[PDB]
Amino acid sequence: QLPNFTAETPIQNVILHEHHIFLGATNYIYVLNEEDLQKVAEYKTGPVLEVWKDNINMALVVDTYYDDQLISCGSVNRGTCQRHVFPHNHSEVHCIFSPQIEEPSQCPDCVVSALGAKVLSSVKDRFINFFVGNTINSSYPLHSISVRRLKETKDGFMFLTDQSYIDVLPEFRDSYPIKYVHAFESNNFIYFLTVQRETLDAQTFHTRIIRFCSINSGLHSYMEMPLECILTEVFNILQAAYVSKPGAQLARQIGASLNDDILFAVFAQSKPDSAEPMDRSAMCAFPIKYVNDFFNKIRCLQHFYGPNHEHCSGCEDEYRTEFTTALQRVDLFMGQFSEVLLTSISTFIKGDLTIANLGTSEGRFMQVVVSRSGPSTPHVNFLLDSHPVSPEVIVEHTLNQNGYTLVITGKKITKIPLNGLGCRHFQSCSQCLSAPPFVQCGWCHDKCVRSEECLSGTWTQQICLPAIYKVFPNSAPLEGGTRLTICGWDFGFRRNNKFDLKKTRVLLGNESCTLTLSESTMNTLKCTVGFNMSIIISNGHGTTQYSTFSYVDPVITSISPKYGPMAGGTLLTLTGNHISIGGKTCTLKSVSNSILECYTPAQTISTEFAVKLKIDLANRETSIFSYRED
């Protein structure tokens, strides 16, 4: 239904340089068109020869500084990068690789690790620096963290110091690795969000932020710090993150300004003692300026230095440090996503609203209005495909705010607008007004449509009347207080965008009904009751009725067989309109409104007992059954 594109293989990374998309996929780097997701050009890195190995892309970076050029980074040749000098207005490909006569002991051109890596580009001080985070296991050159700058010759990389890179020591090489989730630049500092051990050999896993101001070839203020997303219970594993500004509304609840960066991050409580995330996701925002206060508040790093040796001020050999006191926020969605696995996160602002669209381990995409107050229902919710959404996403802003996020699901990267899928895709009346202030819908009698697109004089943004489809059960006991499930449409009130069951009242005949609001939804009403009466439902604007509900009198005409096995195990049949004899409950075989079949409890008696129905009103103890030894 919306602009789509699929490759030959899964897309690992996506970037956008001037009206042209770039999809770094397996063995390929496609060049799409910003307007219609139309594939224009492409480059086949293909299955390369180490043995034969797939060229899973690990990074895409473009810089028009020197000359306009893309730079891809494979995974087969020691994670080496290659240049892509653009044509002119749109082949031609070089390769980053010198030799190490400088000294073979290292490899500045071996940029990316094949076991996960994040790469950032910045033009710091006349040169194009590369900030590389590599997840490393036991194998022989490849820095876990590195500030290698590019040369003006554009055919290799070069560090500047012995300490322009931090490496996890060999004994910890494979033991407890570091999965690099995401990285970004802010306030002159560079950051890296990582999942890892809690400490050396510690069973359970973690999640930390990493900061360091860089000059020439940095790592001078390097410093890790724990990030914990809790709700009122830790969500260790980090799943994805995005950095934008706060909507004017969010800026009051978290104390952030409207131009301050915010670290939106979707977390996930992991399985017992593992780093494998469960389908239980949280999420919270971390004001980058606030993060830069925890750091400014006053234990040696285990993996750089020796765990058992002792060692280690104001920055706009200079060693690195860790933190004991974790920085933490609360789930902004109150854990609305307690039983779902969130994989992607993107954040934009339309007015005051701070909507952030999310992905799921099941391809579920949705735009949810972020706010501490109420966990607003996704005004956009659907499935892309059976392939979980990727954390890789692009957020593009156009004039008068049209916007779109490029979401990837395996091979298919789809172009979704921020303005929502119109008003046409809204199902019910209440849901038609639940859309944000900017959408401007208007339920029109039967269908939902835009403002001036109403065929009849029934277009409105407030008046939604109730409607009862069916109720369960259809009847009730004389005095009994049976539970009621009343399914229908539009039971919530309109305002602040959100709808609740505040002004929701149920009326059974004349007896006012009692609603357990927690268990009730915008479509499912659960009341507890206690004739051939009618049912009424008010949503603050109007009401509806339903005249099937009856208060029938449960009665047992006759019972057979009348005698039975002394032990007990005969089928007892009741007639009329939660059976248990002698106290100890019997069992129900076939229920009805006319006939009941039950298996008698093997009681340790030889006398007779009354048969008691307990349908919310303990009713007739009709004709007594007799246990007797034959």
Partner: protein
Amino acid sequence: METITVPTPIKQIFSDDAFAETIKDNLKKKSVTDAVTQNELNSIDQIIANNSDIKSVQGIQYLPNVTKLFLNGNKLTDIKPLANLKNLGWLFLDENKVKDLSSLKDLKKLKSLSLEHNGISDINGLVHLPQLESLYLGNNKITDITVLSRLTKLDTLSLEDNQISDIVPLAGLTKLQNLYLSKNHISDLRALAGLKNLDVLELFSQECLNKPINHQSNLVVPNTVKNTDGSLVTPEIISDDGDYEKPNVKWHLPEFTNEVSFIFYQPVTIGKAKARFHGRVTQPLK
């Protein structure tokens, strides 16, 4: 006591053009110029007139058997006509300007009342409705609320977006269940310590203030926020180099600022309800 003995057109009964048409459509009539009988007026149980621009409901007195009223989104400023509607059950006058709520005094059959967005300052009139079961006083200017102490039947109760600073009065409302205290100036919470029947709660976005303090280079204002057990709720995000040294929030303020603040957060569970007490304490400076 209001009984039209002679067949009279609907236009003459209800002086307000809008409300007259409403009754017209209700009675399947052709126009406001159609005559109607008292019998036809008696059989009117439920009027639905939200957003009808109705300015007055003069003539409603002749509808004794009316137990459902919907008048949200009108211009209503008077409710004297309703003063003697014997069997009025549900009433909704939101987004109006009804203020002389005393006009409901003798409506002892009224269950669910709604008066949000009415710019209501005082609410004391509600005392005369100990039978109320659903109060809705959100989006107003209510300050005191000691009146509610006697509405000991309310299983629901709004109050969001006012200036309620003291909520103690709600203490004995144990028959409550759905309470909504958002957007207020809720500092304390020890109050609702006994609502052991709650199910839904909304203690969100408080905006408390303290009396102005003389600003120094080293400032310390005591934490005021309290939880349901009376424990000093720990400040989530303080502002301007602020640290929380229990129980006092301290600041390092070299130059002069007009005020400091600290947004808080502290999810609470009362009875069976799970809500999250949130707000922003603020301190004037000079």
